[PDB]
Structure formats: C-alpha cells, structure tokens
C-alpha cells in the first residue's frame, strides 16, 4: 500500500492512529518484514495524488 | 530553555479527536502502550510543551 511519510512508523506491530487503527492494523505476532521507501517521485502528480 | 507546564484537569482524553489535525511524527510511548491509552484514567498529567 502507499501511505504517507510520518505514517510508515505506524506500520508496526503496536501502534495507534488513524493507518494503525481504521486501516492496516498489523497484528502482535507479525514474524515478517515491513519495507517502506519514500516514493514521492512515483505516487506524485503535479496536482497532487 | 523556558518551556510551559500546565495541568490537564477533568477530561477524555482522546486521540482521535486529533487525527484530522496532524499526523504525530514522534509519538513513542514510554511505561505506557499507546494501545493502552484509550484504556486508563490518569490521576495527572502535564504538558510539557
Ligand atoms: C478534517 O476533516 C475534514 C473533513 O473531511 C477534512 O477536509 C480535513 O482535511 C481534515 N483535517 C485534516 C488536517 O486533514
Ligand atoms: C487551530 O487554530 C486555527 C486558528 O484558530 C484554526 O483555523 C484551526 O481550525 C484549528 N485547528 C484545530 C484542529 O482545532
């Protein structure tokens, strides 16, 4: 997913928020990897996204 | 150098009300979970801003 930037330290296993809480909610027991660039160059327009 | 302190008195404190407000960049949480938070009642608290 694409979320914005002072959000991705909410990709995690505990966390609270609007992504953490009404969205993603990455469960206690995860045992993966989260991976997040910034991609401001991609998911940009002009205009705006 | 002069930073504010004040009381927080009688409240809910509730985050969400926030979350259309300004996404927190830094909101690590020590002693307490933020899952928690919505869970307590807190006999003070102070601002420290
Ligand atoms: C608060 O909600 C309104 C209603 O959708 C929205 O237009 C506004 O942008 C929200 N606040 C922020 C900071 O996004
Ligand atoms: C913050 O204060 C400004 C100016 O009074 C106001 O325009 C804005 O809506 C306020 N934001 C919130 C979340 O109350």
């Not at chain 1, 969205?23 to 940009?44: E, H, M, Q, R």
């Not at chain 2, 830094?26 to 801003?49: H, Q, R």
């Given at each position: 997913?694409?979320?914005?930037?002072?959000?991705?330290?909410?990709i995690?296993?505990?966390?609270?928020?609007?992504?953490?809480?009404?969205?993603?909610?990455?469960?206690?027991?995860?045992?993966?990897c989260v991976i997040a660039w910034?991609?401001?160059?991609?998911?940009?327009?002009?205009?705006?996204? | 150098?002069?930073?504010?302190?004040?009381?927080?008195?009688?409240?809910?404190?509730?985050?969400?009300?926030?979350?259309?407000?300004?996404?927190?960049?830094?909101?690590?949480?020590?002693?307490?979970?933020?899952?928690?938070?919505?869970?307590?009642?807190?006999?003070?608290?102070?601002?420290?801003?």
């Amino acid at each position: 997913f694409v979320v914005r930037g002072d959000e991705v330290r909410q990709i995690a296993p505990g966390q609270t928020g609007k992504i953490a809480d009404y969205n993603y909610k990455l469960p206690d027991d995860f045992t993966g990897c989260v991976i997040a660039w910034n991609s401001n160059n991609l998911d940009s327009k002009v205009g705006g996204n | 150098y002069a930073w504010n302190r004040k009381r927080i008195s009688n409240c809910v404190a509730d985050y969400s009300v926030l979350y259309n407000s300004t996404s927190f960049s830094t909101f690590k949480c020590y002693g307490v979970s933020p899952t928690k938070l919505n869970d307590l009642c807190f006999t003070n608290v102070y601002a420290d801003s």
